């Protein structure tokens, strides 16, 4: 069990459906929490998740296995409350996102995809981003934060452990389920 890890996104990060709905992650989740009120499970750690694999809805995902853009369907979602400073890593293409400092994201190591914390991804690291069908690099330019005090939200995209989320068109980053890739089923 690490100190860092275990992320989430701000309420007003887009999530880019396979249909392009450009909806707030927090509204997306909360719709389910407001219909499936009965289905609001809490964790022992007092979190709050719901399965939405029953909506079957498709998100624009990507597959790490070839850095390809495909669909998937989400299986569960999460919500927590947060107040603090979130990292606002911009890139030249006016991308940006609103996430934790210990948030797993990807960078170039000179041609290799490597996996690091967002707080290390400054104006001297190349933060991996999606393109059309493909993956590209863009330069981190502006390095600052926001103050945020609302709620935060996360997923269960267990399927390839990768999703799109963020602002503009978004970032191809890690997804998970329980913890640093455990999967305890059968």
Can you give the CATH number for the domain in which 171 is found? 2.170.16.10
CB 128 within 8 A of CB 108: yes
185 occurs within a structural domain: no
How many domains, in total, are found in the chain?
1
For the chain, the farthest-separated pair of C-alpha atoms sits apart, in whole angstroms, at 49
CB 48 within 8 A of CB 57: no
62 occurs within a structural domain: yes
Q: How many residues does the chain have?
A: 186
Give dist(CA 133, CA 92) in Å, integer: 20
CB 87 within 8 A of CB 118: yes
Which whole-number Å values give the CA distances from 180 to 4, 7, 85, 108, 139, in the listed order?
A: 11, 11, 24, 21, 28
CB neighbours (10 Å) of residue 44?
Answer: 5
Give dist(CA 175, CA 172) in Å, integer: 9
- Copy the structure tokens of residue 46: 């007092």
CB neighbours (10 Å) of residue 168?
Answer: 15
92 occurs within a structural domain: yes
- Copy the structure tokens of residue 59: 């998100």
Residues 6+ apart with CB under 8 A from 158: 75, 175, 176, 177, 183
Dihedral angle, C-alpha 136, 125, 149, 94, nearest 10 °: -50
Burial environment of residue 1 by CB neighbours within 10 A (0 to 12, 13 to 18, 19 or more): exposed
117 forms bridges with which residues in the sheet? 104
CB 85 within 8 A of CB 98: no
143 occurs within a structural domain: yes
Give dist(CA 140, CA 157) in Å, integer: 26
Give dist(CA 18, CA 21) in Å, integer: 8
* Containing structural domain, residue 83: 8-175
- Copy the structure tokens of residue 68: 């390809």
Give dist(CA 174, CA 107) in Å, integer: 12
3 occurs within a structural domain: no
DSSP string, 2-67: -SS----EETT-B--BTT----BHHHHHHHHHHHSGGG-B--TTS--EEE-TTT--EEEEEETTTT
CB 126 within 8 A of CB 112: no
186 occurs within a structural domain: no
CB 100 within 8 A of CB 86: yes
**Beta strands 68-73 and 126-130, pairing class:** unpaired
């Amino acid at each position: 069990m690490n100190t860092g890890h275990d992320g989430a996104l701000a309420y007003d990060e887009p999530i880019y459906l396979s249909d392009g709905n450009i909806i707030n992650i927090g509204e997306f989740v909360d719709k389910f929490f407001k219909k499936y009120k009965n289905s609001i499970k809490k964790e022992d750690n007092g979190f709050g998740w719901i399965d939405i694999g029953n909506e079957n809805i498709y998100i624009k995902s990507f597959n790490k296995l070839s850095l390809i853009i495909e669909d998937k369907r989400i299986l569960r979602v999460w919500r927590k409350k947060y107040s603090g400073k979130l990292i606002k890593i911009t890139t030249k293409n006016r991308r940006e996102i609103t996430l934790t400092h210990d948030h797993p994201v990807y960078i170039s190591k000179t041609g290799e995809v490597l996996e690091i914390n967002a707080e290390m991804v400054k104006v001297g690291d190349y933060i991996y981003i999606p393109k059309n069908n493909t993956i590209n690099l863009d330069e981190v330019i502006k390095v600052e934060t926001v103050d945020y005090n609302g709620h935060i939200y996360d997923l269960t995209v267990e399927d390839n452990h990768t999703y799109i989320a963020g602002k503009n068109e978004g970032f191809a980053v890690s997804a998970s389920s329980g913890t640093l890739h455990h999967h305890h089923h059968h």
